[PDB]
Structure formats: C-alpha cells, structure tokens
C-alpha cells in the first residue's frame, strides 16, 4: 500500500484498543525500524504486506522490503533533531546536543530525551534532514531517566 | 498483527524546542542487544 517516504507509527490491535508499539522510517521503498518493536514479524500497510528483509538482535535493527538504506552519521559536534512520534501525539522535532556512549568497541552518539517506549524507532536527524540513526535502545541512568543511543545500520 | 500509519515528513525544523543534556557514559552491549552501565 503506502510506500511514500516519511515517518510512520507501528500499531497493533492485539492488545486493548489500538496500541502504538513503535515508529519507523520509510526511505527508498524500505521500512526501517528497531528489532524490539516488531520482533521480526510481518507488517501491514493498508491492504499491502511488508515482509522482513534484514534484521539483527544485537544492533536492534530490522528492514522491510529491501536492505537497510540509512547511512548518514552524527558528526560528533553538532546538535541533532529527534523527530519524536509519541503514542496518541503529533510528530514533533526536539533539538539536542548528543552525549557519548563509551563502549569496548568504540563510541556511539547518545540522546538524553525521555519518551515512552512506544516512541522507539523515531528518527534522529542532522541539519540536512538525513536520518543519522533511530531512538529507542539505550540505558536507564541513576535518576530513572532514559538515554538512548543514536543507532545506525550499515548500508551494504 | 501489526500495521503502519503515516506520521509525517522527515525534515529539520528551524526554531525547534531545544532541550536535553549530553552525558558521557561507560556502557556495555550484550548479545541480546541490551545496554548496561559499566562501573
Ligand atoms: C525506561 N525506558 C525504556 C525504554 C525503551 C526500551 O525498553 N527499549 C528496548 C526494549 C527492548 C529491547 C531493547 C530496547 C534492545 N533489546 C530488546 C525504549 C524507549 C524508551 C524507554 N524508556
């Protein structure tokens, strides 16, 4: 069905009413989201069906209809925009300067913005509008707030 | 059974709300894709 570029909500009718379990990015006919949102299951776009193409639990990413298309990266200096799409709420751009996740295999940009778990898969953008990663996989710091990594895939 | 609904365009908004801090955190990533704080 709908294959227009943009941000989309991922909904389920399995629970009470219609519940938003996450968000995704449609680009070049490929739907990109976080693995824990769909668990690799098929998606519906009206009367059309989207089937998983690539996925990885450790990276926490999955693509539908084709290979991962998002290859822009955080420059390590500039502010970014989380295009947050919360459950029952309108999409809203929030500007922030990312922090760092220091890991044994290198550093990852991280955004300290607290949103419901149903906001997972919302895109993080650079000043050119390019998706530099997805929001929804990070850690809970000492005061209870969430800090998400800027999770980016690999464009083969 | 999951379905998708359009939420909008992916554009940078000039004059957007600026919030949030920039923390430098030591983290670890396990085989299940779960992050945790290293101390
Ligand atoms: C307090 N809080 C938790 C939040 C999450 C979240 O639980 N993510 C998540 C869930 C399951 C798995 C992964 C990540 C990766 N491996 C499986 C997402 C966005 C906001 C959140 N706030």
Domain ranges of chain A: 6-64, 80-149
Please report the resolution in angstroms: 2.1
Among A14, A102, A139, beta carbon nearest to B1: A14
Same fold, A6-64 and A80-149: yes
CA-to-CA dists, residue B36 to A60, A90, A115, A124, B28, angstroms: 15, 31, 19, 22, 5
CB A43 within 8 A of CB A10: yes
Measured CA to CA, the distance from residue A62 to residue A34 in angstroms comes to 6
Sheet harboring B35-37: ordered strands across?
A138-140, A146-149, A106-111, A99-103, B24-29, B35-37
Told to judge if A36 belongs to the known catalytic residues of this protein, a careful annotator would answer yes
| CATH number belonging to domain A80-149 | 2.40.10.10
Told to judge if A32 belongs to the known catalytic residues of this protein, a careful annotator would answer no
User: Which residues lie below 8 Å from residue B39, measured CB to CB, with a gap of 6+?
Assistant: B26
The 3-state DSSP class for residue A109 equals strand
Beta bridge partners of A6: A26
Residue A151 tokens read as 């999770």
In what helix (H) or strand (E) does residue A112 lie, and over which residues does it extend?
Answer: none
In what helix (H) or strand (E) does residue A36 lie, and over which residues does it extend?
Answer: helix A35-38
Closest CA to A58 of B28, B26, B30, B37: B30
CA-to-CA dists, residue A52 to A36, A73, A108, B28, angstroms: 13, 24, 26, 28
CB A118 within 8 A of CB A22: yes
Question: How far is the centre of ligand 1, averaged over its atoms, from the C-alpha of A71 (Å)?
Answer: 23
* Structural method: X-ray
Q: Which top CATH class is A6-64? A: mainly beta
């Amino acid at each position: 069905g709908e294959t227009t570029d943009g941000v989309y909500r991922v909904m389920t009718r399995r629970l009470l009413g219609s519940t938003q379990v996450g968000v995704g990015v449609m680009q070049e006919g490929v739907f990109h989201t976080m693995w824990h949102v769909t668990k690799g299951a098929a998606l519906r776009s009206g009367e059309g069906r989207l089937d998983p193409y690539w996925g990885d639990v450790k990276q926490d990413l999955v693509s539908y209809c084709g290979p991962w298309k998002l290859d822009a990266a955080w420059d390590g200096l500039s502010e970014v925009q989380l295009l947050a799409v919360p459950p029952g709420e309108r999409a809203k751009n929030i500007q922030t300067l990312p922090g760092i996740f220091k890991t044994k295999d290198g550093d990852i940009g991280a955004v300290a913005l607290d949103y419901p778990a149903g906001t997972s898969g919302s895109p993080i953008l650079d000043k050119c509008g390019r998706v530099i990663g997805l929001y929804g996989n990070g850690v809970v710091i000492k005061n209870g707030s969430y800090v998400s990594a800027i999770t980016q895939g690999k464009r083969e | 059974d999951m379905y998708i609904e359009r939420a909008g365009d992916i554009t940078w908004e000039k004059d957007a709300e600026v919030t949030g801090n920039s923390p430098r955190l030591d983290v670890a990533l396990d085989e299940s894709g779960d992050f945790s704080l290293v101390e």
